Structures are given as C-alpha cells and as structure tokens.
Amino acid sequence: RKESYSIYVYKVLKQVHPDTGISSKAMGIMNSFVNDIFERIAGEASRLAHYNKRSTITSREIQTAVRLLLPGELAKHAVSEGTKAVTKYTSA
Amino acid sequence: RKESYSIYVYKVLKQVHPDTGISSKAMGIMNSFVNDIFERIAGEASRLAHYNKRSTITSREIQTAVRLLLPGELAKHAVSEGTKAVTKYTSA
Amino acid sequence: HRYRPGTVALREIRRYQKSTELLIRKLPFQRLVREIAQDFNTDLRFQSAAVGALQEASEAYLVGLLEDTNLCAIHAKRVTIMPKDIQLARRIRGER
Amino acid sequence: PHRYRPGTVALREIRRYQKSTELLIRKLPFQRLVREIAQDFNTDLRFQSAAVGALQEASEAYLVGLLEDTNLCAIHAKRVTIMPKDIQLARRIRGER
Amino acid sequence: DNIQGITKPAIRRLARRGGVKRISGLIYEETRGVLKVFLENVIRDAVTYTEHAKRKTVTAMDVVYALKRQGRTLYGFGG
Amino acid sequence: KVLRDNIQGITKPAIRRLARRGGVKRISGLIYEETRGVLKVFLENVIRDAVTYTEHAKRKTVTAMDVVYALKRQGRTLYGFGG
Amino acid sequence: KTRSSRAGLQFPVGRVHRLLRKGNYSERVGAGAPVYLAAVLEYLTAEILELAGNAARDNKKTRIIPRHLQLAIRNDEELNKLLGRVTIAQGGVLPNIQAVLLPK
Amino acid sequence: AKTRSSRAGLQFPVGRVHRLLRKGNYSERVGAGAPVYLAAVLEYLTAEILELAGNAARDNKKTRIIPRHLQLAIRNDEELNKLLGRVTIAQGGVLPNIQAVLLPK
DNA sequence: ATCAATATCCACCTGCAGATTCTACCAAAAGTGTATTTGGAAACTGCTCCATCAAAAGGCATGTTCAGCTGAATTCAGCTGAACATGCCTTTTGATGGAGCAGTTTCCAAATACACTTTTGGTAGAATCTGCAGGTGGATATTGAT
DNA sequence: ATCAATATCCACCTGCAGATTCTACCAAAAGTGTATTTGGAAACTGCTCCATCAAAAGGCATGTTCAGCTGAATTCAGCTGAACATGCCTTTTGATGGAGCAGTTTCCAAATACACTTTTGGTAGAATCTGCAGGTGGATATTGAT
C-alpha cells in the first residue's frame, strides 16, 4: 500500500548532505520529480523501441532517451552514471 | 507494405463531396491526421486505464479519451457516432 | 509622514517575492471552485488537497501570466499593466 | 518617373505571399545549411531529400509564426517596424528563452 | 457570484509576486475572467477523470492528471 | 567541399518574404541577423534530436521520419512527410 | 461480413484493433474500443473533408490540395484548436493584415 | 541473497523500477540492464537537486529542506530550470526579480 | 475631388504534360470456430474523509480623501528603411553513373519471460526528538523633507 | 548632507507541531529451474543518394533618393497609489454523522490463445482529367498634376 520513493530520496540526501533534513511537502515534490522523470524516460524509450520495430527496451533505449530528454552536461553525467551502474551490476 | 488510410479517406471524401478529388500531398496530410489523432486517443485511453488500475481498454476508455481530447461539438458528435457504431456493432 | 507612490509597491514586491504562502483566500476560492465544478457535475464532492492543488496551480499560473503581462507593459514604454498587455501575453503564449 | 509610396509595395507583397504556400527560402542554401549543422553534429550522416524538405517546411512555418508574434509585439509598442527587441520579447513569452 | 469573491487586494498581491508595480483599474476584471477560464478548463478535465472512475469525489490525483493534460505539471500533490 | 558559414546563405530578401507572409510591413535593419540566429538555434535543436534518432537506429541516413519524430519531440508536429 | 460493415463504418475496425494491440497501450483490448475509435476517426476525417471541400470549391477547384486543408483547419475554431500545435506542409497561412498597418 | 540495487551500487530500487517498467506498458520486454540504468539516472538527478537544494537551505540558515529551497535550487541552475520549465513546484514561490525600469533613479 | 497616366490585379480561354483514376493479380491481415483463462463487476462493509454547524477573534477588505506622477496627445527633426533600376552570379532543373546503404532471409547463442518456492526490504502506526515559527528589542538601513 | 520617521534586519529563546527512529507484519523481490523469442552475425541484393554537367534564368547584392516613421521633448489632465478609519467575514478549533470509498469474495460475460479458411488492401501498368502556365483584355488602385 502507498508505495513511495521517500526512503531512497532520504538515503541520497544523507549521502550528499549528512545533517540536512527534508520536510514532508519537499519530500512530496521529490516523489513527483522522480515519477515524472521516470515517465518521460520510459515513455521516450517506449517510442524509441516502437519506431525501430523492437519488442524490448534495453539500457540502450534508456540511454538514447536520456540523450534526447536531458539537456547537455546533465545528460552526459546521467549517461555516465547509468553506464557505470550497469557495468558494475553486470559484474558478479 | 506501407499500409495507408488512403482508401478509407477517399471513401469518406466521396460520401461528403461526390465530385471533389484529392491530391497526393493532401492525402498524405490526411494520413498524418488520422495517425496523430489515433495515437492521442489511444495514449489518453492507456493513461486512463493505468490510472484506474485496469488492464483492458474498452469503448468506455476511448469515449472518455475523446471527451478529454476533443473540444465542444467535435466531442459531442464524435461521442454520438462512436456510441452509435458500438451499439450497431453489438446488435449485428 | 507619507511615502511617495511606488515605494510601497516595490516594498510589497520584495515582500511577496520573498514569501511563498497562498495569496488568494482559501474560502472564497473554494466557493469559486465548487461553483465552477457544480455546473459540470451536480453532486460533486471535494478533497481538501484537491482545492489546495487547484489554488497552487491557479496562483502559479496567474503570477506567471502577470509577469509576462508586466514585460508587455514595459515593452510598450509603460510602467502600468493594462488588459491589452494581458491579452497580448495570452495570445503570444497561444492560450487564445 | 513613377514611384510608389513606401509601404504600398510592402502591403502588396504581404497579400501576395499570404495568398501563396510555396517555400520562400531557396532550397540549395537551406540544404547547405542543414548539411553543415548536421555534419558538425555527426560527420558521416547522409540526408534524404524528404528530410531536408521536412526541415524547410517546419523551419519556414516556425519563422513565419515567430515573425507574426513579433509583428504583434511591434504593434503593441505603437510601432509599425519589427525590431530585435520584439523578437526577443516574443521568444521569452513563448518560453523559448 | 463567488468569482467576484477573489478580491482586488488579492489580485494585487498576485501582481506583486509577479513583479508588477502599477496596476490599471480595468485589470482586475480581466484577471478574474482569466482565472475563471483556467479553472473551467482544468476542473472540466478533472471532473471527467472523476466520472470515468465512477466516483463522485474529485481527488487531488484528478486535478494533477488534468494539470498534466493542460501542460501545467504540478509537483507536491501527486502523483 | 568544405561547408562553412552557410547561415548567411539565408538571404535578406528571403527573410523579408518570410516577414511578408507573417504580415510584417516594416523591417529594422538589425532584424535579419537576429532572425538568422533564431533559425540557427531552431535547426540545431531539431537536427540534434533527428540525428540522435538516426544514431539509435544504427543508420547513416537521416530520414524524413527522423525529422518528424524530432519535430514532434519539440512540440512542433508536422503533417505531410510520412508521420 | 467484416466488423467495419457490422458497425456501419468506412474505417477498418480490424486494423484499428491490430494497431491497438501492437501499440502497448494496455495488456488487453476491448471488443468495442476499436469500433468506437474507428468511428471517431472516420467522423473527424469527415468533418475535415467537408470544410476542405468547401474551401476547394470556394477557390474554384475540384481537387483538394493542402492549402484547402489549412484554410479548413484555421477557419474552423474547433479544428484549429485541435490542431493548434500542428504544421501542415504547403498549407500557408490565413490572409490577415493588422488594421493599423493598412494605409489611411 | 542480496538485492540488485547493491549489485549496481545504488540507493534507488532496481527491482521496483523493473516492475514499474514491465507493468507500465512501455514494452513487451524489459532488458535486464534497463531498470539498473534508469534507477541510476533517477538517483543521480535526485542527487543533483538535493545537493543544490541543500545549499539553498544552508544559505537561508536552515537545516531542513523546504519547497522554497527546492524552487530556488531549480530556477537558479540553468539545466534543472530547463528540465522543469513546464513544471510547478508547490509552495516554491518565485525567484526575487525586479525589472530595472521599475526601480527609482 | 476630377483628369490622366502608369502599373496592377482580376478573369476567362486554351492547349497539355504531369499526376490522378482506373484495372488486374497475390502475400498477409481479417475473420471463423473451439478451448481456456480472467479480469473486473456485482454484492456487502469496514473506515477514513468530507460536509455542516457553532462561535469567538482579529485579521483584512471596503470605502473615502487627495495629491503626485504616469500615460496619452502633439509637435517635429533626423535618419533609417522602402523602392527601383543595374548588372552579375548563384540557383534551377533535367538527366547520368557508380555506390554505399537499408532492407530481407537464414539461422543460432544469448537474453527474457514464466511458474513456484523462499527470503527481506518497505511500510504503517506508536514512541522519541528536534528544528523552527513566532515573539521581542535593539542595531542599521531606507525614505522623505529642510 | 543631516534630521526624524518608519521599516528591516539580526540575535537570542523556547515549546510543539511535525520530523526522525523504532517495532513487527507481509507484500514483493530474489532465487531455481524450464520454456521462448530475438536481435544480431553474415550474406545479398535492388534503390535512392551524392556529385557532376551545362546551360539560362531569375533572383541577389549594390547604390541612390527620399518619404515617412521612430524617438526625443513638453504639456497636462486624469487616475491610481498611500494612508486611515470601520466593520465584515474569513480563519481556527472541535465535534458529529455518515457518505462514499476501498477492501474481500465470488463468478460469469468477455478476452486471449491456436489453426484454417477467405477477403482485401497494395503494387504495378493501363487509361483519362485538371490545374497550370501564358496571353491579352477589362476594370482597379496609386500617384502626380488641373
């Protein structure tokens, strides 16, 4: 019931700013952000796959979707951390 | 190969304007129109089903999608012709 | 003592740009929302969060529109916003 | 020695080009431009004629719209002449900048 | 009736947050009209969402979906 | 041959015609360069996304459908070219 | 015998059904959905073709070209708002000149 | 018996993202690497926003991030501002900006 | 305002080459007929969540006065942009060749989707903590006036 | 520049409403083992695509003149902002009922999954039309001059 991104946002927050806290409304905004970006990326990926007659969405689609969706260096840092997470996941 | 709505558009054209013809570019634009509206409707319907946690798109989703997408009389005429088509289909 | 015109205007601008609270009163706004909604469907009932959401969206929209409006007034060599400005802003925006 | 007053031929041209639908930019320079930009994005890309055609239709449509918004901005400022200031205003209102 | 409920000082505050220094007297009615049209569109789509769910209570999510449709995405009430 | 400074290829008379279709009566001399700048930004964005689509498809020809998908992304939907 | 005929439609219901299933819109597709959708598409096609036919005839032409489509769309408010963010190739613009620019 | 998130070195849940992808209706098939990649990007963007917002927080002498700090963070940074150009942040307010022409002289 | 004289639509005809309409066969949707699931509607129901109601308080709107400064109107000169005729070249456009592509088939090793069985992270309320929202009071800036 | 009159910070404090941690169920990944696609890795065509060629055209760049328009300057009446005194209603807080939710079970009408049987839409030549591109000729607008 009522699945949320709260714990993960709080984890990341504690990673970057160890004694910064976050209000409820702010957390809600963060949740909205996550869901929105999720749906943009996934949507664009879905269209990408559909254009090329592919029935599967690989990490490649996510990447091209990021290149299309995000602006500039935000996009290349996102692509780099995505590739990094994927390669590290593939290992063991 | 390269399936098109050309034949159906031409049929409808001959119904409304029996001595009007249509150029290639005009027909192409018409095809773009049909596909565009198609994907707006189906998209909005998909979102509708997903919001209400339903895994199927019935004529109901299509109708609500039309009501959301179209403005004013366009919507009322579309809904009426849709409901009429569905009932006529169910009776035959 | 009396302040010159526009001084207090600037003061107010700084104040409300500094703050984030809702500017329209909630009860009249809720009454308005319920009127508009009733004419769409007759026995609708409303979540508090729904009215809150509507008020946030509305105030944001209006403020943005009003700064576009202000830009149009400044563009026309004027310091005062007028309905012509709002109409220009809304037609450039493509809202009509 | 006959000469039309300024703005007469302007209005005539406005009517002329508003009646017609043809592309106003010449095709070869536009193609050259598109291939340039694309090349500086990626060097081994090749272009369908229809791709450049699409780009030119989209671009001329866009520019024309922007220029009518610009014209409205000029009229609002009690002016008959469009200026870069007008384009900048139109583009910020549109949300392009 | 209640559309007039939104007051001149309230609209004035909205103008202040928007950076407006001087306000014509004719502005307020235009502002009320605009707000009215905006709410009409948004509430129409939200209400549509509520009806399709065969519900009789408009939820925050209905408003959010409507806003998303209108090209006015909202964070913090979703969603 | 090397492609260079083709943005100037778009001429003052062409921009003027575009203005006439837009209903513009009088044009400041500074307009033409500004117009070129705008067109350049627009084409850069659209062609950037088209090219991205071509890259994802592992193709070396930008197709009309690539352009159309790109335009649709930018909120500038186009009819008449296959999409 | 086809479903289009059963619904009294010109637009192919079957094709619409197929495209719904390939679209990824939902796990399942209702029997009534492709009928309803094809009906709405056929109607919108009809409306546009009527206004376009009118524009063509008004410019003394018997063959509909893109210009006629553009005239049709922009002169009708509802179609204009449905396709407000849409560009018609070779469609041109409506002839409109701001009053202040006319010579007097 | 350890989660995919840890395997990817992430705080964001890869499994949950995977599920949301396949039930999302985006495609018949979801690649094994796709939810990892996406979760990574989400975690990164949240990270950037949260750091800049944290900075906004410190700058206004607060230890708890509120919506205003998020708004300041988003609008003061160009890229985030353009990513969310058509997005409204509740209780965020606006950036303090006054046109020069309105200022005294 | 007429007269007259440029240039300009504005119309109708006409012959004709380029598209449009029309005709004739074939892979691939579309439709049929049976065998299985299944999703979501119907039918009860336990609960958060909304709608009134009441009442007291003080937080703001309303209404009024009155003056300062803004916007609208007029005048007018400088110069910038329109109009036009010259002359020169870059674009058009109508075919030609050779080529480097997508586009198609034919398969497979790798990757993903299922079908059950287990193993934890996630989440929901209680049980502790903790900034911060207000609340004053005094130092500094801002503003308007001599 | 100084003088008074507000307004704005900035510090410093403290209880509390709301954030953080803590405790136990359980939905939902994760792990195992089988069952299916598929997206490429090579091998191969048939086609648009790039790049010329070669005249001719018409469209462009340039330079000159001048009219009309843009921006600067002034005037002034009008209106909107600053401030205040009054009173109205919106804001707070708490309670009460119940209405409209979701949450659970149960079970068909509806949808999915295969294997054949037909029909159709698409593609490629065959067989007509329709704007179009000119061509005067008839009214129209624009501009200069009585």
How is the topology of this model organized?
The complex is a heterooctamer, with two copies of chain A (92 residues), two copies of chain C, two copies of chain E and two copies of chain G.
Chain A: H1 6-16, E1 21-22, H2 24-51, E2 56-57, H3 59-69, H4 72-90
Chain E: H1 8-17, E1 22-23, H2 27-52, E2 57-58, H3 60-69, E3 73-75
Helix pairs in contact in E: 2-3
Chain G: H1 3-7, H2 13-23, E1 28-29, H3 32-58, E2 63-64, H4 66-75, H5 77-82, E3 86-88
Helix pairs in contact in G: 2-3, 3-4
Chain C binds a DNA duplex (146 and 146 nucleotides) through helix 1, helix 2 and strand 1.
Subcellular location (chain D): Nucleus; Chromosome
Main location (chain D): nucleus
Modified residues (Phosphoserine) (chain D): 20, 49
Short description:
Chain A is mainly alpha-helical. Helix content of chain A is 75%, strand content 4%. By secondary structure, chain C is mainly α.
Whole-number tally of structural domains of chain A: 1
SSE run of chain C: HHEHEH
Task: Please work out how many helical segments of chain C DSSP would assign.
Answer: 4
Please provide the count of β strands of chain A: 2
Structurally, the number of domains of chain C stands at 1
- What does the largest sheet of chain A look like? none
Radius of gyration of chain A, taken over Cα atoms and rounded to an integer in Å: 16 Å
Characterization of the model:
The complex is a heterooctamer, with two copies of chain A (92 residues), two copies of chain C, two copies of chain E and two copies of chain G. Chain A contains four helices and two strands, in the order H-E-H-E-H-H. With 92 residues, chain A is mostly helical. Chain A starts with 5 loop residues before the first helix and ends with a helix. The relative contact order of chain A is 0.08. Chain E has one domain: Histone, subunit A, CATH 1.10.20. Helices cover 58% and strands 9% of the residues of chain E. Chain E has three helices and three strands. The termini of chain E are far apart. Chain G has 104 residues and is mostly helical. Chain G has a single domain (1-104), classed as Histone, subunit A. Chain G is built from five helices and three strands. In chain G, helix 2 packs across helix 3 (32-58) and helix 3 (32-58) crosses helix 4 (66-75). Chains in contact: A-E, A-F, A-H, B-E, B-F, B-G, C-D, C-E, C-H, D-F, D-G, E-H, F-G, G-H. Strand 1 (45-46) of chain C pairs parallel with strand 2 of chain E, so a sheet runs across the interface. Chain C binds a DNA duplex (146 and 146 nucleotides) through helix 1, helix 2 and strand 1. Chain C: Belongs to the histone H3 family. Chain C: This is Histone H3.3C. Chain C: The modification Phosphoserine is found at residues 19, 48.
